[PDB]
Amino acid sequence: MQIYEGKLTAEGLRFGIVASRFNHALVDRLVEGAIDCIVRHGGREEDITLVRVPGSWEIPVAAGELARKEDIDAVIAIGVLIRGATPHFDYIASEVSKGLANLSLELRKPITFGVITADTLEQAIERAGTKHGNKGWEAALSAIEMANLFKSLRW
Template sequence: MKVIEGKLSASGLRFCIVASRFNSFITDRLIAGALDALKRSGGSEDDIELVRIPGAWEFPVTVRAIAAQKRHHAIICLGAVIRGDTPHFDYVAGEAAGGLARIASETGVPVAFGVLTTNTVEQAVDRSGAKSGNKGFDAAMTAIEMADLLRQLGDGSR
């Protein structure tokens, strides 16, 4: 049996990190985690772009434009949507997740979902480098593995 799986080496791969400015005290920590993962995995700073957007609602339109350029092996989306007292959370989180999944499927560019969707600020802090690790780091590792896997499967478009 032949098993094909992505390796955790970012060497020679190009990444775009798309991060929301909303809840920047959280997203800045997620960015640091993603950059740490990319560098620890052999990625070059010259092969990483950072695009800042206002909030999670803007992920789909931004990521679609980036993916269409076919310049990156994977895109890492980082943000934090924290539940409030209104249903706004449900709309923003749901549309961001659904939109990004569709873009990855339609374009063939891996899109790692590092957008925290939490009930409290404390949960977001925990997931951005405190008790629960750093989900920015985790999202970058997913992007690395998927970019390498697609390269092995013969996606030579990038």
């Protein structure tokens, strides 16, 4: 059986992060998590490009610019959506997930989904570096594993 799997060494890999500014008190924790993950897996901080966008809505069109760069191995898309009073949350979370998902297929490139989609502020705090982990850290770790996997499937 041919088995392809990605190792978790980030040496030589070059990453893009697109992180939204809305809910920055939490998104700042997720971006810390993502960069920590890359650096402690052997990535260089100088091989990370961080793009800040005003909100989750803007993440896919910015991810599209980064993912089109030849020298980016994977993109980590980071944000925090918290459900409010209106149905707005439903529409943003629907479109950001679909947009990133489509780009990843179109450009044949890993784009990881480190976007918290929380019903409550408490849930969001749990997943941005407290008792349910850091989904920025998890998204970066997926991107490291996917970048290597792609490396090994091409050659």
